[PDB]
Amino acid sequence: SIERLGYLGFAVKDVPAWDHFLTKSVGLMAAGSAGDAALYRADQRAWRIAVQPGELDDLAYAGLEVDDAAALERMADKLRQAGVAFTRGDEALMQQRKVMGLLCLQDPFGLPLEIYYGPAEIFHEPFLPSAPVSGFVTGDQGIGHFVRCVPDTAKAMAFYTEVLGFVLSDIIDIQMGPETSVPAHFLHCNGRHHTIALAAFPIPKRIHHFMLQANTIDDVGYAFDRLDAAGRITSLLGRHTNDQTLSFYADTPSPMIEVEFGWGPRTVDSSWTVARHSRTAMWGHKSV
Amino acid sequence: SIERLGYLGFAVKDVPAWDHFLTKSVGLMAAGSAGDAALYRADQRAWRIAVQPGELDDLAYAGLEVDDAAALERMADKLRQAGVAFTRGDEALMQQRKVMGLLCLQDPFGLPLEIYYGPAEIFHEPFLPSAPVSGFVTGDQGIGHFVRCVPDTAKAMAFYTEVLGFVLSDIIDIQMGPETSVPAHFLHCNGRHHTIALAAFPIPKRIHHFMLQANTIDDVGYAFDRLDAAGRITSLLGRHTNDQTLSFYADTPSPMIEVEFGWGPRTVDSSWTVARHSRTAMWGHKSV
Amino acid sequence: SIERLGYLGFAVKDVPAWDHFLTKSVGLMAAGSAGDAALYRADQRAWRIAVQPGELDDLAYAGLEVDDAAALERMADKLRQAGVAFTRGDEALMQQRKVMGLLCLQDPFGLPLEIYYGPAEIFHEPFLPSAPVSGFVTGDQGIGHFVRCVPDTAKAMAFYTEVLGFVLSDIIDIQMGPETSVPAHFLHCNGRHHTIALAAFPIPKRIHHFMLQANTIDDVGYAFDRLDAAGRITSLLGRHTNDQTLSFYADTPSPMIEVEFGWGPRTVDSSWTVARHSRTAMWGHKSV
Amino acid sequence: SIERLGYLGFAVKDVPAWDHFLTKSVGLMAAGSAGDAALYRADQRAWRIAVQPGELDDLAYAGLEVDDAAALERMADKLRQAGVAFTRGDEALMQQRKVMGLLCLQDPFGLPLEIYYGPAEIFHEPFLPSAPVSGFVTGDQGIGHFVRCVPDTAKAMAFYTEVLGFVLSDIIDIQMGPETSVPAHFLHCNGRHHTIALAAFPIPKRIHHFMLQANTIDDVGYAFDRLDAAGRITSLLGRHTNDQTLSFYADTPSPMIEVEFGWGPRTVDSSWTVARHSRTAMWGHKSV
Amino acid sequence: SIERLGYLGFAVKDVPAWDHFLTKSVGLMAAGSAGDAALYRADQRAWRIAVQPGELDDLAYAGLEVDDAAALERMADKLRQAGVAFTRGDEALMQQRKVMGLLCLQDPFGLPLEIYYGPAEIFHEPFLPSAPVSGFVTGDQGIGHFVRCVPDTAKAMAFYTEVLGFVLSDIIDIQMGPETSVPAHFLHCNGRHHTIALAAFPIPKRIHHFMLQANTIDDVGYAFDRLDAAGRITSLLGRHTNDQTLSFYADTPSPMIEVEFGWGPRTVDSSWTVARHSRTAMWGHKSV
Amino acid sequence: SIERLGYLGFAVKDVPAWDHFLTKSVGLMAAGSAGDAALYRADQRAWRIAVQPGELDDLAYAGLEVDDAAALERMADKLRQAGVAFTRGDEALMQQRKVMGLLCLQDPFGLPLEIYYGPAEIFHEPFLPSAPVSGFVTGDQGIGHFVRCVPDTAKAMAFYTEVLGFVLSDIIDIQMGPETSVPAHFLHCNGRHHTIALAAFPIPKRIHHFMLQANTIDDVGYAFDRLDAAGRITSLLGRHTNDQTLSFYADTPSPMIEVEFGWGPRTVDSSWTVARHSRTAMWGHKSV
Amino acid sequence: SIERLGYLGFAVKDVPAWDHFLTKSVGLMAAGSAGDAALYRADQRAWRIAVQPGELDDLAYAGLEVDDAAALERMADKLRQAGVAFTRGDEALMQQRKVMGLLCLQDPFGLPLEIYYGPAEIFHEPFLPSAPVSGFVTGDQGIGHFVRCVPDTAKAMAFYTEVLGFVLSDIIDIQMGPETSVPAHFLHCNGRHHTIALAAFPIPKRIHHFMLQANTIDDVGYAFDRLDAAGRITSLLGRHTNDQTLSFYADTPSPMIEVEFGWGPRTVDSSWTVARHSRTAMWGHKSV
Ligand SMILES: [Fe+2]
Ligand SMILES: [Fe+2]
Ligand SMILES: [Fe+2]
Ligand SMILES: [Fe+2]
Ligand SMILES: [Fe+2]
Ligand SMILES: [Fe+2]
Ligand SMILES: [Fe+2]
């Protein structure tokens, strides 16, 4: 099974705006480039987020990490047994993502996934944020999470759980209209309450948002003000019912894709009981 | 196996008296109604105790929780293999109990049991006690425990352990008369010392008592005084020999059913040694 | 010297609105009445806030606590030596405020102050909030703080420090207009960063706001939503530069008087260095 | 496998001397009698040591505890499979030892062993020592340990490990004469460094000593003085190389059987490496 | 008495080199300018180090902080009583250093000292290091320390202790030649082992070095490499005998003035015993 | 699988120089001799390092420890199944190494390995360092680690992982020349980040270095100075990227074999993710 | 007042025996010589115990430490005011004891005392014990304590308390014969329960014993065995009633002077109540 979400690549129409957004607003460290992708760091990893030019204005690929070469071959076996097409990343691709091995595939609705092992770390170039943020919570929980939009949540669930080994944490019925709600399914693969959530939202993007977790509540408060100065806030500060992430949301430069910047969630384990919630917000998060 | 006791439903002759008892005396939060049942909360769950009108004046059903849908199907398999009749709760019932799935059955002596998963939580309506109680100890240990009266403890034991997966903690020989004792068997299914105890008591009720665990010793002391003002005390403060719950007992409005309000018990695990005790009270608990 | 702020009395045009505000929105416990004043509790004290009818729509009196009878006589001596007029509260007044002794005086700009000792506690009637709030931080730090509006900050400073024994913590230059700021002076008399702040604001009220400190960040988040539902929010969540209180502001039913509901400030002692800040908000607190 | 050593029974020529020894010198609580045996307590158990009259002046039986009835049947199966004779204790015997079930057998060299479950606890009669001792370390580690004398350590080892499930901790070569040592084998069955040690000593007793573990170093120091006043000391205070028990030894009233009264040993687990030591004493323990 | 060292101003021949040194090498945050001085931050203070153009290539002034206005007047009284000339900083100077009041004087050998209160803090512009450094240890211990070169240590000692209220921590005999040592006197005014040390070194500078204290050992290790890349290292890593600061030394761009970048010293209090050391280095610090 | 590295034997041209090096410089305790080998201790074990005369000037054997006799037989089975030749150490050899049993074999490139159980401990002769070192970190992590030079890392990897049960922690690409790097593979067998690393270095020795871990940072600093006085330093203090050992390197008296003396590394477990690093030093370690 | 006992000098008939005793038996570090005195260390101080040749076979002087030069002058003033003769140590003496200043005097019964400040520390030569001892408890509590024999305890008490500033901790009536006891008075001058005790013993020595405090109980146990091997033990292990030092006693090479080697005493402060004890030993300490 997948151990954690390790990296995200975006293909965007406004590379300079994304560069400013990730550095001066979010606080990530610029980390050079690989090919036509600008790289950004949140920790000891050589890169966590890549930004390349493209008309998609969307998530172009997600890197799903396993712990060693044998684990990667076991995932190849799981894909074969499930009839899921995949290819082995070539040397050029391994070099581009700075990994020792990877399998390239897509989820049932077209999102490219890369299952990899052996990522590059650069402790001799210690992390230096570009904006005042004390650090991010990553480690064994990976980079954060994202909410994946899908046309068929049951079909997506079968793939992410049965093939990739994610596990359902809980469900939130998200009220859309007067008598319309969407059941968002939240999936974990480590202690992070969720790494991927699945929802049948009427949005023309592959994801609704990605989330980064900062070390302190002040990190979140300060970030809110930077994103507000940029005119990007989409939600007031609030706290979620299920993971209890205390966060705000803001627009990325790609329309309809948001970032969530948060602190202090609950973590999970093998004893996490599936439960259902009727609201996303325990408090706050008023939409603006 | 069952993971925890999640809810209790009572069918009672005096609904208003039960309402006052659970709120002003015990401290639970009123939480509206579902059908003809008044609902009461002790924590983040949408409800923990339901009270409906009925001549039984007794426990009408107990909800036994598992952690996910697959666990529920495994319980269905266990019931089938054991020859225990059950039905699948219909949509109306799922809606009524606010669960994602449930199996309806009875124990060997007629107590309706509901095995369920996916209960509703409402963190956007944070718990507010109706009387001064700092909170209850629930979580993975469920709502509390009850003592189930049975005509044949061996037969009840075989069902609760072999079919439902409860585990014997210990036994207390409860002296009834000069040369008559009843061997009460205490069963766990999580860290709570017991969730169900079985005893062959000469009482015409399905249970002898249910127990709620408060966070502090003062919570218990204050509650004693509220129940004393109501004229309901049945035992002085005391502490049990086996779980070391420090509690008092009081009459509910249903004759012969008591509540136990306690604090500070021992918890158990896979290393809990079966032992036998000759008394229920390490100290106190004088009957009044 | 004064040890802490113990109580506040308001004279208001809409007593029912204040009652609902203090209970259902703020979470205080209704605690009966004394004379024509409705009483409200935040802790073990018989009362902390009193609300009486009056056209002022303002703070009518503040209770400044000392620790014993001899301390009260020493304050009487300080008042005499400073030429500050005062009277000794009569039996009726002592009974009304539930204190063993008190001195009645005014600050230089007309705010009635009551210096008292021997307040009433009622631990047999344990605190029960009227809205979901886990508790307030009071104890030796008293009930909270207020910002006192004055026409002459130097004159007010001389009285509060030299006569009453408050000590300057720090100053914030609060920008009012393009080239106009008001230097707010923050005074402590115990570990609370400030109990009274002095500012020459162009407001027709005796105070700008009073502040209550809740135990948790969720207490603050939940309260924000209750005050938002009431249409009373005046500031978004934020954190102050000097005391680092994380709070929001809301309108009380008395025009131009606000409440601040907060969490997590720094505390002070004899080693607190006077410093100057150019902004009230380290982050957040956008006015709405 | 055996979980812990729970009780010891001695058959002795001088019952009154043993009574005084166990109470006034060691500090155990007198706990009545069962049949012709005087009972002694160290904790919540109804009894830990029994003393009956007999010419043996030796250990008459040792009680080896398991956690439940099914575990007892599994031990019966292990005995059957190994060809070890045993009988099931009858009702009279169960009553005498205050247990729910037991198997009676002998080790290869004639020591009666009783494998049992469901011992009696009496928390309503809290432990009261007969001499100043703050308490004993028992719980999951059982009552203590004993050193079993055997003519053939390999044969004894095969029985205790393969049949009963004890595990080797380590070995000490105990120098007896100029060019003669005995390899003492120390066996655990829980966190206690050893519960039974095996040694081919030239002593005409079944055991060399039994050990009780007190809570504090002062407990040991005070006990030394009581046993010294009784003229029973056989070793000065010292500390063992392998378990690091800090103890002294003294003669029981039965010639050639000693007691060890100690404090502060190391505990073990599944990661304990077998090692060999050339001396019993890290420091002290000079023979007197 | 002086409470702590709060700021340092340098007058230097190569302002750009100092700018790069303080930011990219040391890690301080650039914080704009005041007049012809470039400002640098280490924490919440608006500035800690100022760099202005000048031929001195030396420390131009040191800011000595007190906690309030009355403390400043008491220092004025001490200066008057001691016959030490001083002037009161005018409005322009107060504005330039961002303080509420200050006294300008010199030590007996010409170093300008500024005794001040009410420094500016800017928590709304949170500290952001320019190089990877997790933070500095400042707070009540002030910015760090410096070693003041003097022609007459006894005369300097009398001034710093009797007039300014510094206290001797200890002395190190620093061997200069074969039979020549200089007794360096280390003075504290808060928990920092020393804030000013006095030594009669044959150097043509006012100070030998200034020291900044980083939060972690890795901060120091990483900084060593940055200063080594710049070709500035003057000492290998080492640890001092008296304060046990673990540090290295490097050249600033002003010849003969060094910086010390360190971690982990001992702190002092009223119980610190004066002692004498024969070496500066407990280990390391080899000169290069 | 192998549990830990327990001992090292060197065959050297200058036994007296090695004796002085291990005692006065490193701090090990001289512990007599066995045959023609001088023995040295770091802890409770009778010996950890042996030095015998020989022209090799290299590591002559490494002792790989398992926890009991059955574990040793399981290793014999693994060797048989893998076709790896081995012999059983005879009584003389067991006596020489002070072990209860051992298997003698070689790795694929000629390094003699001894797999053993039942080492001798001598707690009655407590460890006494020969130079100021507070102690070493050994225990379940064994004596330390070494870097094994091999001509074929893949072949060495297959043996150490598949046959002996070591597990890959991570890889560092060690740059040798302008366009030449060697991929060093770091292997663990317990919590120690690595016990053996494999690298295809162009060195004519079996190992590049062995490492000992001291308890404190001062232990390392003091040791640096002792080895510097001896003229043996080969690296300045630094910290590694992968295990984060803070250490320095020095020459042993055998040319081309170094010692690493370090502190404070990270430890590993079953959740350690394989990663790749481009440098050995997070900071420091400049070669001298 | 005196702050602590810092050093002891002995004049002895057998310097080599004292050298072996202090190093190989007690564990102190040999630290060269000063004049005709051999020096010994227990910590960072250049020396703690000096041994010179002399027929006295007794304590020749005790060093009483104060914290600074002004404290030394205040002691000179106290001596003058009390009429106690003293001289100022000359340069040669200061050099000999490695102190910055000292006053030479005697107690009323001829023991030379040296009151000093500014002792030498040598952290660049870290402490290395000569026998297995983990370290000594010194610091602010000084080197240990001694029991001073006096002909008139009241007269000695007046001097040590009124002149030197020691404070009575408690008294023990030490039974000498059938109807003869000596009231030993125990005096502190810091947290150490006592630094000097006064007793009218019929011994022809200035002191009965001096005591060193080791860090661990094993340090004491191991030391007991070393002193036993040397044939010097005078008391078995035991614990004192008043300070609760757990120690043993042994003969020094000077007849009638003993050493006490201990662990774990209680410490004192301004709230220590004077009490009386009838025995020296809470347990143990049997004389041999
Ligand atoms: Fe999210
Ligand atoms: Fe109960
Ligand atoms: Fe406020
Ligand atoms: Fe033993
Ligand atoms: Fe320095
Ligand atoms: Fe290494
Ligand atoms: Fe003593």
Curated annotation (Swiss-Prot), chains A, B, C, D, E, F, G:
GO molecular function: biphenyl-2,3-diol 1,2-dioxygenase activity; ferrous iron binding
Residues that, per the record, bind Fe cation: H145, H209, E260
EC number: 1.13.11.39
Any GO BP: xenobiotic catabolic process
Entry-linked InterPro entries: DiOHbiphenyl_dOase, Glyas_Bleomycin-R_OHBP_Dase, Glyas_Fos-R_dOase_dom, VOC, Xdiol_ring_cleave_dOase_1/2
Pathway: Xenobiotic degradation; biphenyl degradation; 2-hydroxy-2,4-pentadienoate and benzoate from biphenyl: step 3/4
Name of the protein described by the UniProt record: Biphenyl-2,3-diol 1,2-dioxygenase
Organism of derivation: Pseudomonas sp. (strain KKS102)
